[PDB]
Amino acid sequence: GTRYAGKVVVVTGGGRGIGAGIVRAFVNSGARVVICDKDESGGRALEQELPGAVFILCDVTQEDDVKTLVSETIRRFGRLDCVVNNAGHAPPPQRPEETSAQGFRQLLELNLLGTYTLTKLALPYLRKSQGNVINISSLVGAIGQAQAVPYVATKGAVTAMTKALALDESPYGVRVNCISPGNIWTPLWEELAALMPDPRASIREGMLAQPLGRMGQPAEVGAAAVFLASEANFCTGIELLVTGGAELGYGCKAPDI
């Protein structure tokens, strides 16, 4: 591919799931991709598989890891055009009274402050390249979700932070956008479903939450990311929904008393 040829892209959480879909899409578009992930399994295999992708073991919650991620990307490839902040975690369902401030703080560290830290360290280089930031948020930041108060709050923060940073970096020509996936079939989805009483039913429910009648694929999030990096040159501060229409219309969510 040539749509994003000569460009260098960092994808956090890139070893599996949505992240690996985004890595593949960018490689297919002609870019060099640095896969950042805290687990070795998936990311190392992806580096062997894809000419054009390399793996760096990095925990975005560790500032030293992130500093090294950026410095190694520049040392090895000479530029930085796009950061995709995909690293994140969705805990299992929790009733509000079962959450804790400390668990909430830890989830903020992963889902919000890791995105903040890498973006900050990358922006001097993105300014030089007129590059861009893509944050992976979630539809539930916009419309809520039951049994996930901390998770929703973190994604509401990521989406808002995208718009604020877009304002700040617009004079420097650096675009900042987010993607808000709905239900995407991934290893996180399959694991969360396995903890449920009937996993088959939970997956069936997840497919029917979308008018399209299926869950989405990592490749579809990847295509949205490549669009935002390579062809969305008048888009900044937008929230690109990749949800199969989940937010549309009335549904089962629960005569006037």
Ligand X SMILES: NC(=O)c1ccc[n+]([C@@H]2O[C@H](COP(=O)([O-])OP(=O)(O)OC[C@H]3O[C@@H](n4cnc5c(N)ncnc54)[C@H](O)[C@@H]3O)[C@@H](O)[C@H]2O)c1
User: How many angstroms separate the most distant Cα atoms in the chain?
Assistant: 66
Cα 59 from chain centre: 15
Helix (H) or strand (E) holding 8: strand 8-12
List the one residue from 9, 12, 27, 46 that touches ligand X (CB under 6 A): 12
Entry field: residues in the chain: 257
Give the nearer residue to ligand X in terms of CB position, either 110 or 126. Answer: 110
Site residues (CB under 6 A) for ligand X, limited to 52-111: 59-61, 86-90, 110
Element (H, E) at 179: strand 175-181
Q: Is 147 in the site for ligand X (CB under 6 A)?
A: no
Q: Does 9 bind ligand X (CB under 6 A)?
A: no
Question: Is the CB of 30 or the CB of 142 nearer to ligand X?
Answer: 142
Count of CA atoms in the C-beta half-sphere (13 A) of 219: 1
Angle at 254 between CA 252 and CA 255, to 5 degrees: 100
Binding window for ligand X (CB under 6 A); candidates: 15-23, 97-105, 194-202, 227-235: 15-23
Whether the CB-CB separation of 180 and 241 falls below 8 Å is answered with yes
One-letter amino acid identity for 151? Answer: Y
**Site string (186-205) toward ligand X, x via CB under 6 A:** xxxx----------------
131 binding ligand X? (CB under 6 A):
no
Looking at 51-128, which runs of residues are DSSP E strands? 53-57, 82-85
d(CA 223, CA 235): 16
List, in sequence order, every residue forming a beta bridge with 133; answer none if it has no partner: 83, 176
User: Does 7 belong to an annotated binding site?
Assistant: no
Question: Per CB under 6 A, does 49 bind ligand X?
Answer: no
Least distance in angstroms from the C-beta of 229 to ligand X = 17
150 scored as a contact of ligand X (CB under 6 A): no
Q: Determine which residue in the list 117, 162, 183, 230 makes contact with ligand X, applying CB under 6 A.
A: 183
C-alpha 123: how far from its chain's center?
Answer: 18
230 in contact with ligand X (CB under 6 A) = no
| Least separation in angstroms between CB 42 and ligand X | 5
Residue 16 interacts with ligand X (CB under 6 A): yes or no:
yes
Q: What is the dihedral of CA 32, 22, 165, 159, to 10 degrees?
A: -170
Q: Tell me the three state secondary structure of residue 184.
A: strand
Residues forming the active site: 151
188 annotated as belonging to a binding site for a ligand: yes
Pair of tokens at residue 106: 């830890």
* Ligand-binding site membership of 86 (annotated): yes
Q: Which residues bind ligand X (CB under 6 A)?
A: 12-13, 15-19, 36-39, 42, 59-61, 86-90, 110, 136, 138, 181, 183-184, 186-189
- Give the annotated binding-site residues: 16, 18, 37-38, 59-60, 86, 151, 155, 184, 186, 188
- Give the annotated binding-site residues for NAD(+): 16, 18, 37-38, 59-60, 86, 151, 155, 184, 186, 188
